[PDB]
Design a protein around this nucleic acid. Sequence first.
RNA 1: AACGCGACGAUACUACCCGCACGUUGUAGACGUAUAAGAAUAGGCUCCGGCCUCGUAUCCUAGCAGGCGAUUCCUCCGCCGGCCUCGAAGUGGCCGUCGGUAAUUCGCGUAUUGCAAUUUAGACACGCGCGGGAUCAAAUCCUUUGCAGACGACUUAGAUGUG
RNA 2: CCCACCCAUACCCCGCCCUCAGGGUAGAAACGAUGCCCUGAGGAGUAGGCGGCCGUGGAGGUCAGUGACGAAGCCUAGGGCGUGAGCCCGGGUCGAACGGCCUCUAGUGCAGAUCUUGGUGGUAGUAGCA
RNA 3: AAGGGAAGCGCUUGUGACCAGACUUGCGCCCGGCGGAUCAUCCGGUGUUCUCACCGGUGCACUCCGCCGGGCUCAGGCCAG
Lengths: 143, 108, 153, 127, 204
Amino acid sequence: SLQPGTVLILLAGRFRGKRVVLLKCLDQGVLLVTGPFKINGVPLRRVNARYVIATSVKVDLTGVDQAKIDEVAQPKYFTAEKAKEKASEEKPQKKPVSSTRAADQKAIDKALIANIKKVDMLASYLASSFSLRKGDKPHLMKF
Amino acid sequence: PSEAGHRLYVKGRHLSYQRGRRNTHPKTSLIKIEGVDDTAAANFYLGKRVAYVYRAQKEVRGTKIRVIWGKITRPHGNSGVVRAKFTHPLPARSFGASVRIMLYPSSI
Amino acid sequence: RYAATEIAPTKSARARGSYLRVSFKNTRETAQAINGWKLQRALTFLQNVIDKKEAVPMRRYAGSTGRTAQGKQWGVSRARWPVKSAQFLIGLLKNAEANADAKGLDTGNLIIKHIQVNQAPKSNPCHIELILTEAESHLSSRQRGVRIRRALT
Amino acid sequence: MVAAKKHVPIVKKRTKRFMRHQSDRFKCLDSAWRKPKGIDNRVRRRFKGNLAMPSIGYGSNKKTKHMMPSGHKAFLVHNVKDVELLLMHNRTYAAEIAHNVSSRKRIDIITRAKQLGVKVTNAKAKV
Amino acid sequence: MSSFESVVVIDGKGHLLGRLASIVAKQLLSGQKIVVVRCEALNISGEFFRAKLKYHAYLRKMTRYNPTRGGPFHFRAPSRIFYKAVRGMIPHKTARGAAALERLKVFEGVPPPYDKKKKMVVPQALRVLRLQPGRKYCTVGRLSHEVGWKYQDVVARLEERRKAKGAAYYERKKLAARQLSEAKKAAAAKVDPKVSEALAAYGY
RNA sequence: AACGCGACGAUACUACCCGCACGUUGUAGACGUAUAAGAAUAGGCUCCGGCCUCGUAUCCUAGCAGGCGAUUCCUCCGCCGGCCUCGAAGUGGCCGUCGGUAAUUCGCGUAUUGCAAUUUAGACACGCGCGGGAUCAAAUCCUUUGCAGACGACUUAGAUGUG
RNA sequence: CCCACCCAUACCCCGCCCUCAGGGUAGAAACGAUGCCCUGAGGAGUAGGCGGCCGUGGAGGUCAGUGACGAAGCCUAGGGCGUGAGCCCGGGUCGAACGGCCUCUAGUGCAGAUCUUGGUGGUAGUAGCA
RNA sequence: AAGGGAAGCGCUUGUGACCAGACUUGCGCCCGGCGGAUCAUCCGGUGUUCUCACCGGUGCACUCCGCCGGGCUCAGGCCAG
């Protein structure tokens, strides 16, 4: 159900309800996803397949740099400056985004965002949170 | 102005324990999920998470909300009521009480 | 030694009597009646009990006790006039007042902070004691993050 | 050292005591277990809803018997010679100072055991 | 559809006493708040002389020495009859049963708090859906009136007033629905050809 | 009904009412807690075209837990006043002002809570605080009375008056 | 008559305890061999039979045992071990002796006996004090 | 703290009150600064289990014994995915 370039619905974590786009499927059940940030605020981040839900909206990935994605897919990209950043955090101010990280998003979200602005109302879909109304049945409704 | 709901769980009601005519077993509880009517509907939610959320008197680590976690194990009967196993048996005062049934781990 | 050991001895006056040949039950009832009262109010009440103007309510040891209208002061029906225990308690309260005067406390603002009646070696005598006093985080990362975001916004 | 030898998890088949019948009703009866010899009483007959009887089925695992939750076995220590006996068992045994040992002898035992790598169950008694 | 609501109001007209009480008791013990109205409009299967005979036997049963305390309090109101059925079906001598009975409410007629609320129906207890057409039935209100309920006429007059007010409300509903129909067609052109066919394809 | 209820008078203290700062305050258990015809069932509804197994329906539902700024919109919502309405255990409408408001589109921010950890967020009730208005009470004991009485209890009377 | 479902200590899988049964373990780098390892089966219980353990007073040997820097005893909404009888530790009190281990010894283990002695309850501030 | 014509007891939660454990880092490698001369080999004596050790001599900068300013690995407590 999940392929490179598929819209996912996060069910847990800080970004709960936030519909995102899965770009690359990693190993041991982890997934590399992104908003894109300019749409719903979700950055280039890795989540769990058991906590995502796969919709059938599939977005085109033509023109997207696979090499750049495969660099973020490495096993120390996110958990690297983690020790230094948290320690440095110790009036409150927003911790700064690794120059490298703010620099990477822009590339991938520029290409992906362009292919999303093409499909009718898709920006609106991705920017909105999924929520459960009254009378809707998760075992019957098709995603 | 979002003026919209923020629910991501399915409502459920802790009804009772798995019991005989006399003997009661607090290990496994009976949960009535909102909108489930039959065993196929139950089979969709087998394996899903369930949380009993209640309010306490003392705030221990920033909140008075305490939660008991468990999972849906197997369907019960023919009416969609499910059996659930929790890390601790439920207080037995929460018969007919609310539980939150979470969709993870997901398979769809 | 006294039962109430949580009161400083420099701020309170203490009175004691042992092997008192007065009824333990009646003395308990009148001590419970005068518990927590001002010294002047308690002395006036005890003198009234002597003069049959006010009655001590019998709460625990009140089997087959005659009724009297004075019981309405306590919302109870069974009241009595324990005259001899009243005299003994008057003597002990006077001893406590003399001790307070010796220590230099203000007798106009003393309350019966502690009063206690125990059984003595056996007729059923009792011990009485009383004390008068002057009346006067391990937060998680997610919660830290949500709180930081709330502080910013 | 501080850490104990690797062991299988310590499981307790029953965490509460086996109180004597009617000990909650009569104060002349202590709570220590006594097997009832009456032919008609439901506790002996094993009727449901009554007190359980001690049995060998509750016996703890052989590899975790006599083990504290830290994984050590308590050895009653009276002096420096006893902790020197306990030398060769740092990871399996802990030292429990006898209740009648004086404070200075306790200080000496604690110093020797800290040199020795041995856990002391009651190292903070008279501090 | 196994839906949970805050409080559900059940219109008691045309409902079998025992079956409705069974459904209500199960809901109360599962944790749903129930408000039953028109207990005088409730129905009992069988014939009226059989129901009256049963109630007269109930009256016969009484405590000797002291009728004031410990005796069977013979409540004559239809709401109390339905409450008696529900209490007999709920374990009232427990804290759980007391909580369920505190979740239950019953009234005669439809009080003004509940006249503007939606009244639901239980098809599993309806007379017209359950009984065979040739079979007899009686009215709990009639039984209560013939055993000593003093307020049949007052409830009847209040129901007449409520029905008149409901007729006025329904004339207003007619006006609103007619205007809604005219408004839909009037903006059926002024909209967007795509949206219209888009909704038709998506089922709206 | 001494653990059923209604109307009214006076309510000193305390703080009676009003607004929010809320509470490390409680709740057999919020998370869209949305939805009023009546009546019949061997019939009914209607705009009078027609329609009715089917509430698997209608409303509402997008936006840092929902930010800031624009083109465009007169739609929805709430608080206060005015006119009336609702009494079965008491409310809604109309007008008006005032505040908010994606039906279309766009821009600038969200990152780091680090792969999940109740999304501490509702209501009523209760309590501490201020700053605005206001109020300024009784009962019991005591004496007396005898329409009352085993004792309590009850009917009476004690403040300048036919005491 | 047909379908699905609920559960007993019953039946099946796994873990652990005990018992019984069947095997292995020396030119010892060898063992509380009264030990250790492997496999299988079994598990209610009156009268009765057998075995192992817990506890008390005193005796011999030993721990070059503990102790006025606090023995024993007692109290504890404080802990740890043992299936259990019981054993060990912490806190408070206290003041002068006591304990573990192998044997010996016996006036050695209590809920009953309308038990013995002593102390103390409800009845009850009641009957009553002519 | 509980209490609407008994209490007391078993299994299992929950609330309140109160506590015993666990951890505080250990092990081994790559660096540098060191402080030192108990590296090896050989010689004489001694004791032993007749080939192993102990003493004194010899041996002093990629040889041995401890510390510091760093880096890496592994093993490390509770609850979990």
